[PDB]
Scaffold this active site. Sequence first.
Site, PDB file in Angstrom:
ATOM      1  N   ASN D  19       1.002  -1.233   0.048  1.00 16.16           N
ATOM      2  CA  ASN D  19      -0.021   0.119  -0.262  1.00 16.16           C
ATOM      3  C   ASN D  19       1.084   1.344   0.156  1.00 16.16           C
ATOM      4  OD1 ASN D  19       0.212  -1.151   2.955  1.00 16.16           O
ATOM      5  ND2 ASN D  19      -0.087   0.989   3.287  1.00 16.16           N
ATOM      6  N   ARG D  20       1.997   1.138   0.444  1.00 18.68           N
ATOM      7  CA  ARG D  20       3.069   2.236   0.449  1.00 18.68           C
ATOM      8  C   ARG D  20       4.450   1.679   0.392  1.00 18.68           C
ATOM      9  NH1 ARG D  20       4.848   3.746   5.574  1.00 18.68           N
ATOM     10  NH2 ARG D  20       3.739   2.547   7.172  1.00 18.68           N
ATOM     11  N   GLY D  21       5.293   2.815   0.098  1.00 19.54           N
ATOM     12  CA  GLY D  21       6.739   2.379   0.160  1.00 19.54           C
ATOM     13  C   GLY D  21       7.240   1.522  -0.831  1.00 19.54           C
ATOM     14  N   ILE D  22       8.250   0.587  -0.599  1.00 16.01           N
ATOM     15  CA  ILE D  22       8.879  -0.212  -1.393  1.00 16.01           C
ATOM     16  C   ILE D  22       7.767  -1.405  -2.054  1.00 16.01           C
ATOM     17  CG2 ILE D  22      10.465  -2.066  -2.083  1.00 16.01           C
ATOM     18  CD1 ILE D  22      12.435  -0.578   0.297  1.00 16.01           C
ATOM     19  N   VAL D  57      -0.075  -9.430   8.632  1.00 16.77           N
ATOM     20  CA  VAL D  57       0.672 -10.711   8.672  1.00 16.77           C
ATOM     21  C   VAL D  57       0.979 -11.364   9.925  1.00 16.77           C
ATOM     22  CG1 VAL D  57       1.527 -10.010   6.432  1.00 16.77           C
ATOM     23  CG2 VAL D  57       2.780  -9.331   8.340  1.00 16.77           C
ATOM     24  N   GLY D  85       7.070  -5.357   6.687  1.00 11.54           N
ATOM     25  CA  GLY D  85       8.198  -5.528   7.786  1.00 11.54           C
ATOM     26  C   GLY D  85       8.331  -3.970   8.276  1.00 11.54           C
ATOM     27  N   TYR D 148      16.074  -6.764  13.927  1.00  9.97           N
ATOM     28  CA  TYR D 148      15.775  -6.570  12.579  1.00  9.97           C
ATOM     29  C   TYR D 148      16.693  -7.502  11.728  1.00  9.97           C
ATOM     30  CZ  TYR D 148      15.332  -4.121   8.256  1.00  9.97           C
ATOM     31  OH  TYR D 148      14.711  -3.753   7.057  1.00  9.97           O
TER      32      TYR D 148
HETATM   33  N1  NAP Z   1      16.112   1.291   3.731  1.00  9.51           N
HETATM   34  C1  NAP Z   1      14.759   0.690   3.451  1.00  9.51           C
HETATM   35  O1  NAP Z   1      13.799   1.050   3.324  1.00  9.51           O
HETATM   36  C2  NAP Z   1      14.934  -0.769   3.200  1.00  9.51           C
HETATM   37  C3  NAP Z   1      15.995  -1.567   3.444  1.00  9.51           C
HETATM   38  C4  NAP Z   1      16.036  -2.725   3.562  1.00  9.51           C
HETATM   39  C5  NAP Z   1      15.026  -3.615   3.534  1.00  9.51           C
HETATM   40  N2  NAP Z   1      13.632  -2.907   3.648  1.00  9.51           N
HETATM   41  C6  NAP Z   1      12.396  -3.707   3.588  1.00  9.51           C
HETATM   42  O2  NAP Z   1      11.514  -3.464   2.663  1.00  9.51           O
HETATM   43  C7  NAP Z   1      10.328  -3.501   3.084  1.00  9.51           C
HETATM   44  C8  NAP Z   1       9.342  -2.359   2.740  1.00  9.51           C
HETATM   45  O3  NAP Z   1       9.379  -1.286   3.683  1.00  9.51           O
HETATM   46  P1  NAP Z   1       9.387   0.264   3.559  1.00  9.51           P
HETATM   47  O4  NAP Z   1      11.083   0.577   3.336  1.00  9.51           O
HETATM   48  O5  NAP Z   1       8.619   0.486   2.233  1.00  9.51           O
HETATM   49  O6  NAP Z   1       9.124   1.042   4.911  1.00  9.51           O
HETATM   50  P2  NAP Z   1       7.302   1.242   5.042  1.00  9.51           P
HETATM   51  O7  NAP Z   1       7.069   2.740   4.373  1.00  9.51           O
HETATM   52  O8  NAP Z   1       7.232   1.582   6.576  1.00  9.51           O
HETATM   53  O9  NAP Z   1       6.472  -0.166   4.370  1.00  9.51           O
HETATM   54  C9  NAP Z   1       6.323  -0.789   5.355  1.00  9.51           C
HETATM   55  C10 NAP Z   1       4.877  -1.789   4.947  1.00  9.51           C
HETATM   56  O10 NAP Z   1       4.671  -3.025   5.497  1.00  9.51           O
HETATM   57  C11 NAP Z   1       3.122  -3.013   5.968  1.00  9.51           C
HETATM   58  N3  NAP Z   1       3.167  -3.820   7.230  1.00  9.51           N
HETATM   59  C12 NAP Z   1       3.966  -3.415   8.467  1.00  9.51           C
HETATM   60  N4  NAP Z   1       3.614  -4.384   9.403  1.00  9.51           N
HETATM   61  C13 NAP Z   1       2.474  -4.966   8.833  1.00  9.51           C
HETATM   62  C14 NAP Z   1       1.769  -5.908   9.266  1.00  9.51           C
HETATM   63  N5  NAP Z   1       2.027  -6.430  10.549  1.00  9.51           N
HETATM   64  N6  NAP Z   1       0.851  -6.665   8.643  1.00  9.51           N
HETATM   65  C15 NAP Z   1       0.728  -6.296   7.253  1.00  9.51           C
HETATM   66  N7  NAP Z   1       1.430  -5.310   6.613  1.00  9.51           N
HETATM   67  C16 NAP Z   1       2.231  -4.535   7.585  1.00  9.51           C
HETATM   68  C17 NAP Z   1       2.816  -1.522   6.163  1.00  9.51           C
HETATM   69  O11 NAP Z   1       1.678  -1.502   6.098  1.00  9.51           O
HETATM   70  P3  NAP Z   1       0.834  -0.102   7.026  1.00  9.51           P
HETATM   71  O12 NAP Z   1       0.724   1.085   6.093  1.00  9.51           O
HETATM   72  O13 NAP Z   1      -0.395  -0.619   7.469  1.00  9.51           O
HETATM   73  O14 NAP Z   1       1.559   0.164   7.898  1.00  9.51           O
HETATM   74  C18 NAP Z   1       3.654  -0.672   4.888  1.00  9.51           C
HETATM   75  O15 NAP Z   1       2.616  -1.190   3.746  1.00  9.51           O
HETATM   76  C19 NAP Z   1      10.402  -3.935   4.525  1.00  9.51           C
HETATM   77  O16 NAP Z   1      10.109  -5.207   4.912  1.00  9.51           O
HETATM   78  C20 NAP Z   1      11.806  -3.487   5.030  1.00  9.51           C
HETATM   79  O17 NAP Z   1      12.345  -4.337   5.986  1.00  9.51           O
HETATM   80  C21 NAP Z   1      13.520  -1.499   3.439  1.00  9.51           C
END
Ligand code: NAP
Lengths: 235, 241, 228, 230
Positions: D19-22, D57, D85, D148
């Site tokens: 829904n947002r982000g990556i 999840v 995550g 993490y």
């Molecule tokens: N630098 C980085 O950004 C980076 C680096 C390495 C890996 N990652 C990984 O990439 C993935 C994307 O995260 P992001 O960077 O885009 O940050 P983010 O904007 O906070 O995205 C988090 C996403 O996960 C969902 N989520 C979280 N907890 C959940 C749950 N219990 N059940 C269902 N959905 C859940 C959130 O939904 P809601 O809107 O409802 O919260 C949101 O859509 C993550 O798993 C992160 O670990 C990111």
Amino acid sequence: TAGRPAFVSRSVLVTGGNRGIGLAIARRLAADGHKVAVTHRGSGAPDDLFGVQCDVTDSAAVDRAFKEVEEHQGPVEVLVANAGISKDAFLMRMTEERFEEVINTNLTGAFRCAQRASRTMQRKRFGRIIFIGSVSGMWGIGNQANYAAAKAGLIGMARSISRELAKAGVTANVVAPGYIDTDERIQAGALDFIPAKRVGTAEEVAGAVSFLASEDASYIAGAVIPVDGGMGMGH
Amino acid sequence: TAGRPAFVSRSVLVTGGNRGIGLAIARRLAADGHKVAVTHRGSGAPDDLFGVQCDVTDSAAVDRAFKEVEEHQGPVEVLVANAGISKDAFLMRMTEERFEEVINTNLTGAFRCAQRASRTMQRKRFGRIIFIGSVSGMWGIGNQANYAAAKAGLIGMARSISRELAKAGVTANVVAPGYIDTEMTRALDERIQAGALDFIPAKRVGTAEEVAGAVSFLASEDASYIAGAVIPVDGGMGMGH
Amino acid sequence: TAGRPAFVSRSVLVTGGNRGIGLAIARRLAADGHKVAVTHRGSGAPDDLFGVQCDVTDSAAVDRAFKEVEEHQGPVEVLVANAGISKDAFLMRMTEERFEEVINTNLTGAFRCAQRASRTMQRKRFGRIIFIGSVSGMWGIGNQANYAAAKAGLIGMARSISRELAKAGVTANVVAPGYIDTALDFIPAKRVGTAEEVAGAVSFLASEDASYIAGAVIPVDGGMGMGH
Amino acid sequence: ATAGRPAFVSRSVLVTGGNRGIGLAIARRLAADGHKVAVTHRGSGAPDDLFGVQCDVTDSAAVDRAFKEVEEHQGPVEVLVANAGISKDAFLMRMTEERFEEVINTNLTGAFRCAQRASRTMQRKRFGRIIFIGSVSGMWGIGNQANYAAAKAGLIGMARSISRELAKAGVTANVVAPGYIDTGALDFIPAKRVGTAEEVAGAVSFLASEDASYIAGAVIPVDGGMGMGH
Ligand SMILES: NC(=O)c1ccc[n+]([C@@H]2O[C@H](COP(=O)([O-])OP(=O)(O)OC[C@H]3O[C@@H](n4cnc5c(N)ncnc54)[C@H](OP(=O)(O)O)[C@@H]3O)[C@@H](O)[C@H]2O)c1
Ligand SMILES: NC(=O)c1ccc[n+]([C@@H]2O[C@H](COP(=O)([O-])OP(=O)(O)OC[C@H]3O[C@@H](n4cnc5c(N)ncnc54)[C@H](OP(=O)(O)O)[C@@H]3O)[C@@H](O)[C@H]2O)c1
Ligand SMILES: NC(=O)c1ccc[n+]([C@@H]2O[C@H](COP(=O)([O-])OP(=O)(O)OC[C@H]3O[C@@H](n4cnc5c(N)ncnc54)[C@H](OP(=O)(O)O)[C@@H]3O)[C@@H](O)[C@H]2O)c1
Ligand SMILES: NC(=O)c1ccc[n+]([C@@H]2O[C@H](COP(=O)([O-])OP(=O)(O)OC[C@H]3O[C@@H](n4cnc5c(N)ncnc54)[C@H](OP(=O)(O)O)[C@@H]3O)[C@@H](O)[C@H]2O)c1
């Protein structure tokens, strides 16, 4: 037994053990109770160690050095391939010669000694081949296209030897030290990549070699033991 | 300097030191000269060692165990997180409960002990956090979605702890054993009968004393510059990338 | 922006692309839209691709090969160091000659091309050095003390090149294939791979979707080399 | 043998946290490839361009109903992208049990719940792509991330245990490990920049394409060389 297994005095050969990390390795293994021989390129070894002249780029000299060791202390049971050099340069600045000379000494030279030692190691059903690699093998220090390739090749060679000879009691492992003190590297900022925030000592490297040469590492094969203070953590 | 460094008797805590690999670790570290304490769940401490009852799934019990060990032999300097279980199943058959209890014991249980020990370890500028992982963490034994995830998580936790605390003399490393013999009788190893030797280049299973030998090295003075490392005691089984 | 990035036709050189995996890589990159040149040793490239004669054990031939490529299709932007050989033997039966000729072709030969390619890549601020490694590099296939050392040496070289030149848009990665049709007990897929599957991973590393990938080992082995 | 890009096959894609982000960039990319993409959300509502289901999840029942709603809309899931995550950073001395387990239950266990729910029909259909979104911290160990990094490293072990079991049936499990993605760290990044969400979505598009059938248990680092090591 519950404690440390009974000690066995092994016939040890440390290539390039006349100074530096190789000297600390040789003196540690001698203090452990092993029969330690070292190699040198002509200047000789210190008084406390049996020395033989050997250039690891000369296959006939490697075979010649093993003959002296077998005559002095018996066939080599623990090989510590420590001889190596560095010829750092930017990638586009690195010539063919400065690449091949690092490969011939660090990679091919370690193979010449491991191949020469594998003869008696297979027949006696025992063998410890310990390559001295580097953090640069998997971490990739800049300006080291030749050095990082040779040190990483030790991992592939040690694991191909292990998968063939571990069933016959011959294992090959790699000790990968980080920055070891034996200062300009610190001036260039090497401490920023080391979580321990310090350089290692040659005696700390020898401690890992003493473990791989002891009776506590018979079930360890193809392993990369990092002695880098956490520097090479990654994938 | 030239020989083996001067020995320091460390306050040791070994989780699950009543049987199996943990018993061999506790006996080896005691014969090395350390002040060894173990955790149990009712049976008590083996030999003449010090024992405290503790289940690694209970943070209150872990804190209680460290408190009693601190009083008996000083704060824990070397932690050996050995307690672990296995609940194998095919991916389509593995339930949420059997996944979480493996995670809660093997992964979270190791965190509870590592977190509880970090306070005094940072005070004294010394700490050895030794996790007992498995070859399955990076090699991925089938039917072990939970077990391999927990054992692989020990590597990530040990490396995050090391990057933060290695400057303060507190390091974290993982010993990843392969198939180790823990049989109490002469009976044939059921894993061997299933063909486990086909994946071990050494063509034999390891002994608990060999794992204890690797733990003894990480707890000694010869491993002060080792942080975030995976020590494979698997006879070359887990070689790869 | 949300979809696949706009394609950019790169100047591609594939060493040993006259047959085998190298030929499938060249045809894949040509079909993607790249200007694809290949090196051969006298057999001639297929009439569909541009061919230069080069033996990767000769630095003079490497310098001349890139020279002919620069004049024809511009300086090399994507190098695929594919040329390689195998000379297996038990450790007790592997000679110095058998070890060195595998190292000279697989490892040193790949360096000669990468070093020559970095001359123009580093100036134009774009570079994709793609080494064709093998699962044996980290898995250690038996009877391959020379082969596994060369293939593992490609990893250290690619990561040393990456740490120096990634800041200038020049990245180096390794594709590590398993057994490819041109032993199944250690392959979880229970089958061998095809050259087109290796070419598919190379196409990805040579596209606009892999600019943030550096020093990576991309295994195309069906899971055979899983471990540490 | 075909010399060019293999003929594209439109898959049934589910992207957790899309829904947002990556996750949103991953889903929009896979949809632009031609796949039928569905995303999960938690009440905020999926974006106007993608079919959305509600799923946390951490709830096995909500995961079970989510795959049911996806199957009724576009067929059973063929490609699963476990992207959801969270991160709860803290020093080791300051990290609590609740703070540790919360990251594990979402990043690690939450990825298992989705991977378990999709496994049976993937085995019967002889096709399956389970793509876990890991992190460089899994193998590199970023400080203040005992929870993490353990979760992101656990994704590697799980994907490799899944692959060794189900690769023979055409079901692979891989991990995309991004570095810092823009959605003092530049010192450890050889590229001297941060990645974009589209660069992570590009690697996912590769692992979900017909060019990645022979890739199982792999870690695809999208970190600009940050996690280079061992
Ligand atoms: N630098 C980085 O950004 C980076 C680096 C390495 C890996 N990652 C990984 O990439 C993935 C994307 O995260 P992001 O960077 O885009 O940050 P983010 O904007 O906070 O995205 C988090 C996403 O996960 C969902 N989520 C979280 N907890 C959940 C749950 N219990 N059940 C269902 N959905 C859940 C959130 O939904 P809601 O809107 O409802 O919260 C949101 O859509 C993550 O798993 C992160 O670990 C990111
Ligand atoms: N920070 C570090 O120092 C560090 C870190 C990681 C890994 N290492 C590795 O550890 C090993 C030794 O470390 P070091 O600090 O002691 O460096 P070093 O002093 O340069 O070690 C070189 C040793 O090898 C011998 N040698 C060199 N070329 C030879 C050849 N062709 N044939 C035979 N012997 C040869 C040298 O003998 P001569 O005296 O006659 O030249 C000397 O004894 C090297 O392989 C190095 O790559 C070092
Ligand atoms: N081949 C192998 O055996 C092998 C290979 C790789 C790794 N390992 C690892 O090595 C460690 C021990 O191996 P093992 O063969 O000796 O297993 P084991 O014989 O079944 O014993 C494991 C120990 O853990 C304790 N324990 C289990 N769950 C606990 C909990 N929640 N709280 C506290 N203590 C708990 C048990 O105590 P109780 O007596 O009260 O149950 C027992 O003392 C495990 O972490 C295992 O994953 C083993
Ligand atoms: N199972 C596999 O096939 C497999 C698995 C993993 C990795 N790989 C790697 O993939 C690459 C190609 O695989 P392949 O199956 O296609 O092998 P191949 O069929 O034998 O073809 C090898 C190619 O390399 C060229 N070559 C060899 N030595 C050369 C030299 N010194 N200078 C210039 N060109 C040279 C050959 O040219 P000529 O036509 O003149 O001989 C030929 O074009 C190799 O590096 C191999 O290590 C293959």
